[PDB]
Symmetry: D3
Subunit: 318 residues, 6 copies
Amino acid sequence: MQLFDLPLDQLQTYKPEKTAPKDFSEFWKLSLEELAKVQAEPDLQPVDYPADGVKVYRLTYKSFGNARITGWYAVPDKEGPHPAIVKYHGYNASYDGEIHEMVNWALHGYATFGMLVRGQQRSEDTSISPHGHALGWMTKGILDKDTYYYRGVYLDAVRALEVISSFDEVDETRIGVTGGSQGGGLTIAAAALSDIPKAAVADYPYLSNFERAIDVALEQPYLEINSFFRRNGSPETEVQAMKTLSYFDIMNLADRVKVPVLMSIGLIDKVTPPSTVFAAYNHLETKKELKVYRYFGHEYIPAFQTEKLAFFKQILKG
Amino acid sequence: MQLFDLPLDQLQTYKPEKTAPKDFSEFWKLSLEELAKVQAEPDLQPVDYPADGVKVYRLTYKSFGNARITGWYAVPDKEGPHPAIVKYHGYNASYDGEIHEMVNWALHGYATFGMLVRGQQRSEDTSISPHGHALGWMTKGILDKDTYYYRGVYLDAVRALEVISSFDEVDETRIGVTGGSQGGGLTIAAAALSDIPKAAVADYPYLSNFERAIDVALEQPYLEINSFFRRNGSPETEVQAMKTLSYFDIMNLADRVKVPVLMSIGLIDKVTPPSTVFAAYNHLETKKELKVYRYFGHEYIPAFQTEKLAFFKQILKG
Amino acid sequence: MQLFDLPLDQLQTYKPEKTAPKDFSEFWKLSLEELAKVQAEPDLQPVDYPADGVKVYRLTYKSFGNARITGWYAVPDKEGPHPAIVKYHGYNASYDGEIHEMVNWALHGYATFGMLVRGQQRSEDTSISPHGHALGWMTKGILDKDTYYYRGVYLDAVRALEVISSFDEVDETRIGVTGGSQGGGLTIAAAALSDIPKAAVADYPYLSNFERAIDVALEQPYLEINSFFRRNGSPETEVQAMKTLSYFDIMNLADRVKVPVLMSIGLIDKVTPPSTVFAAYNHLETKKELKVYRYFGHEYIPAFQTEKLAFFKQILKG
Amino acid sequence: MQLFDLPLDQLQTYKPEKTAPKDFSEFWKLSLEELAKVQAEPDLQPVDYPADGVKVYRLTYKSFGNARITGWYAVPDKEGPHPAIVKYHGYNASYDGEIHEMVNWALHGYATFGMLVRGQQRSEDTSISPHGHALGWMTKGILDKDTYYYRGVYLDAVRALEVISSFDEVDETRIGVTGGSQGGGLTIAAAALSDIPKAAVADYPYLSNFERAIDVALEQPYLEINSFFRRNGSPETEVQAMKTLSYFDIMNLADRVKVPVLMSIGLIDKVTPPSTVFAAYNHLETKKELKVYRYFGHEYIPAFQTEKLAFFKQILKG
Amino acid sequence: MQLFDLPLDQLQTYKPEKTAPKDFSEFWKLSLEELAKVQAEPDLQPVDYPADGVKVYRLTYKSFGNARITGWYAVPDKEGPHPAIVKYHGYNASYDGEIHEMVNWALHGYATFGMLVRGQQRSEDTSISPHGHALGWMTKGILDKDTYYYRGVYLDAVRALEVISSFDEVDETRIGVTGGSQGGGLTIAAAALSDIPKAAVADYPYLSNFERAIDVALEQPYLEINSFFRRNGSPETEVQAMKTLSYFDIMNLADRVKVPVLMSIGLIDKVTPPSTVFAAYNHLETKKELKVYRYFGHEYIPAFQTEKLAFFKQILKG
Amino acid sequence: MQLFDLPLDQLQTYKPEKTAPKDFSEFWKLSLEELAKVQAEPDLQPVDYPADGVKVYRLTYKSFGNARITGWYAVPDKEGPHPAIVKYHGYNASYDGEIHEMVNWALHGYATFGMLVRGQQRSEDTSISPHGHALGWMTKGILDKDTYYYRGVYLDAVRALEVISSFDEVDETRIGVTGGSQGGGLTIAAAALSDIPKAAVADYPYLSNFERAIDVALEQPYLEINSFFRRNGSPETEVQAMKTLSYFDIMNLADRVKVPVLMSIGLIDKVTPPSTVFAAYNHLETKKELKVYRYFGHEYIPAFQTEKLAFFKQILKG
């Protein structure tokens, strides 16, 4: 397609004020405290996979709300410990958990776990639907930070790191986090909420700068928010929903990241608008780099794959 | 748009064999038993509304899974006891609960309750998401009849009738059920599972003839099923999901309806294809009429509104 | 969809200079004089409608050009006189005259007439096509104010008020005017050209700020003007057509309205762009209120239905 | 795009039974009588045009309903008397009357008149709108053959031939008729109702086999009929409208054509479906040829232009 | 459609700095030197065409790279010499060479040759594909000015003028160049590279202001450039490709035109954006006129046909 | 989307008669002879890549027409000699040559070469454009089998196998071929024309059953053929083009494949319609399997990736 958001020169300095409420930190502390009360009880079940040099398994663990979260976990068939990667997927975009991708990461030398998102693929979402929402997960439980869909998801993302670091074959000092869109948002959230990750690569991250996203995105799934306001029109509901979203907005969590970050953005992306991604990036206060691709949108960028592999190889395989 | 399904002469005789499993009746008996364990505990909260001649309220009750189900309840501002209507809404299509429509029904002389569907608007869905599903509600809990999303919805629909008939101002012998698409499916399911309704009017009913629907629909939401099979490709998964859907398929429940039914179908409907609606209609063994509109699709049909009003007036008011 | 016109902060003060030619007032005076020469000769024909508490009829009267204009007229089956409402419909958007809507208004307590637009539904358009026009009615007779399509329509709209006020069962001191899009334009035009209405509720009004509308609308039917210029390209034709449109532009007629006005606008409406509606609103010099809905476009807005009912109930049922 | 109607072998034998009512001939005789009552009073007004070898004029004449019909008339700037062509245009598709094309026809050696269709461009439509119609001209006056829009158009088309043949510079024995879509329908109707034309070339003719057209067309304007039935749903209305269309259906007029006919059809045409064109062609009982183009739709076909020029050259110039 | 580029007031003064590299003139001199080494060896083959007053032929000649370029050549069947026109066609938009158009130009009095573009229709493109390109011709050989697709095309365009001027029946002092889009770019390029043309009429010219075109066009075929950058992502490749395009950019060649130019632009054209055309126009330093059509896009503009014919008639038939 | 081609039972037995001309075998023998005249002169240039366990290179060789063909070649960083794979890419669908994918294949244990298609990416197409063609490569040189675009491509594909098997580090007895769409067509053509491959995996193969493809495909690129017939309408041209395509149609080459073949087809594929793929499959007379995926179209199918890896592992590694 074509350009549509602020010009690159303006994007470079686009940095909205944080929207985090006064109890933002307290909310995350309490949420992590809740997660800590649930014993992970990890279980590894081998899987038959048509490749040599790797051992593949279905990893399952317990998280917030006693939810059963799973994903494929692939490890180099070598004597570890190994560097590791926790890979997070896109919104409604996992097709059988991307087992092939996980195996390729293991072949590249990383014990890799592709966490599958609760309610979207294979993992259980034990959180209820307290008040009715628009089609999708974006507005599920949006009237209260405690019941919001991403509360459980972010906690699951942190638990994934606690579980993989606990493995004897994983060098917990060399774990990376990565993912695209929704996976990119989870990558930033995980690095902001856990001291475990050592490096983060986020493709056009999702769940950033909600106030702007709903007025500039031209495609789904930010627009589910707009849809919820069409179906629940009281002015008070809109105020409450934006407030709960502010607790999950990665531009609010970004200044907690302490490790190196590599991020990408395609200038014609109408799903995660460039402005929203620059907002998250400009809120990071850590070693960081934003690779801008003028001719790409919300999709796989071959040149950035090269950058991602070189970054993880430099930091995690040092 | 234009014609696309079987020609009318073929639709008239289209009657697929039932797909109900051997334990279909047991499943519904057990499900109704699970519903009866939950005390309804109805709560009526008056609402200020800008109209004379009617009293409006927010009606809330407890249903399957201890879920809090709600909706607007409007009653003629005259001494009862009054004929009544339970109105069911379309998939993801309630905008603040259609309060205006409920009021109009009351002005027409019917104590009317617009049940809001659990998880879609206002009403709570306490059922979890056991295994991950495609975007939407169609595949939530589809790997087991006990966990499937419509199990709770159908029971809620029956409970709505139990609650309204219990009111002293409602003539329990003169209650009708009505709704469009998903609302039409709920209308048929309620009349199939409850002896309360005395008449049913279903617009192009949804949740019918799933095996055909997924192969002929050209718009959502039927296609969420297809989407789930794309993301969960195991052959066994497909077989299991179709088996669970067969317990909720209104063509399998249709032979249980024993009161008069009025149904509509637009021949250019690509959401609820004509074949799927004729399948439900052809399984009904009761006083019935199917109004076919050649030039209408999945939308409001003015001529059918007249038929609907005439039908309820004739049966519920005489 | 999404935002596209001027930002709300700019819309608030958007007020183009009037485009009314020097003989604007003379044109309307002469036009009303022509209408006055035609005897209304109203005729009421009862209709069988499936509802109690209301009497429904087909009302037919004679207007400008000896045209036979009709519509459904519904009255509370009570001893009047009653407050009344003249409801105007959208462009090419009446489906059998919206009889059900008219009946609901009567059930709300108002003797209501839904005027059907000449040439579009049931009413006769005796005005010829003097010079050929683009597909539709927007350019029919556009080369001369005397032959322009809306000359007859606006006069018919005023006659509708003269006819309903003449009824013994109608309290002519309590008549409201209402309608959406084209119906909203007719509502403002009627209130600007007749001293009869006591209150006006106009949804996103059509036929406003033509100069801007043709450069900003992204959907039909303002674009019929552009289509006419593609087919009749002389520079002189464009000048003449914009001049005739200026006599019908509701932003030019707005300062004649003397009664309270309630108006709505959805910020994503690409049919009646927000700027065009703010233009009409900012030209009103009367008790007024503009309800802005960020997430709605050119469609039914549930929250505004509440506002409309409360407004008419407060003014007309005082 | 791609194929979509009956396969070629089936198109070749597709010949629906005529739908002409018992008084079809009487209707046309009476209509021609109404036309003859109006004196043509042709007026030729020279026009300055940037080309040598041709004299251009605006030709205006009086027709049915005292309507002023006009169009460009271009003649070879040489002593006549000259073969001539009456060219008819597509539905809502004349842009300033195609003056350039008329000039080219004259440069090819034919005194050519491009009749502009009443109400669509330049020419006046004095027939009223008796009962309201869907957007467009297709349903204007459709409840009665006497008031239907094409009654005036067909008579205007015959009158065009009477006027051009009356000119001393035109060889009345060498006049052809031609046009595309609506122009093709007019071409056939004119040759059916007038003995003036000596040859006819019709591109994918419109206004044919209405019963099939409304069920198979996928684009306008056929679909205006469907639109009218959506807005005027009485069963009797549909029956009456189809009856009036049957008087203007070129498949019913085709057996009256007694001069050579050349016709074209693109197999991917979704506006004038191939079946509808083959229906007209198969009802012709005269020297005829149907050129079928597999890869073309409703558009200019270069190869057919050669066929058309060759045909008129052979017949009108020898 | 609707407006989308800079407002007309801004377009009027839009004039980017030239992007021509330091060896721009040397490149064209050397390129013309290469063309001069190839003997034209023109061949005329008569064609059977169904019209009197014109002789039609297939003209074929040799050009750069020993390529065989052809097109239809039509001449008035009169004693010359004649004024002449070289007509260039749109990108991938010649349907059998537009023989009918060529014949009409001859009937207007001009010996006319419609050059068909190498590789696109009938003419041979002997230049290879040196490095792989995106679908289409826009990026073929783009990594080097010497191998770029338009090098051969522009040279062929100049050769066309050398060949037609060489004919005894052609008055070489009265030759015009004309064409639309890609044909408009070739018209400007030819007039910039050859002293032969005496007048030029270019419709919305293509191949102008590439830097802006790729960021503002919303349709094809400028976007092939963007597509090539998606498939060949090294930063160096983008720099090299923009540099080679700068040698062919008509805004860089425009100041070489010494004869009168007539140009058109439709304000809603999303193929050749108005800004890009104003850029070329504002770089012309010769007798010039730009006709702006607010309601037209990338298509035939009837009013401009009149202007084109009057311009060529005034200059070429003086 | 949804189903659209023949139903599965009919696809299973769909086997059109071969369309190969009498000199089909001679053409391929002569073409292979032309290829053998060109010395391959392979050149391996190491490339720095961010991964351990593999050596990456740019492999370049000379093929038919002295064309320089290239692609990425990745080898396990272990002592060989290694099983190998030649991977062919989709039409206009290589983004920088899929270096990442080639590396992954090597990490899976296969010396892998991703041949880049001449003229589409990186590789040179030295064949000229003899007669002009529609946008794209499908019709380039289609008027003669000797000049047709795929002649060079198929020979390049065979040459790729000759080059990789010649490497000392490659076990020439364990080489597979694979690719999707156009890549699948190349996979079958290579296995048909070379005895080198020991196994073939083709995703929905393109370049099959051209007579049906042009009449049933609903997306490109098949439709470029149709586009060429629109621009070159001579009946003889169509006959000649279909004749040249018959020499490259994989259904005509299929009976020459004598090694195991694994193929896939998505039933909603509108680019390579299921019928066209079943045609190729049904002409194979070798160990074969066709995996049918009801809910997938022309895209990556996760389950098939597992099948593909399992197949090559079983055959090439044992």
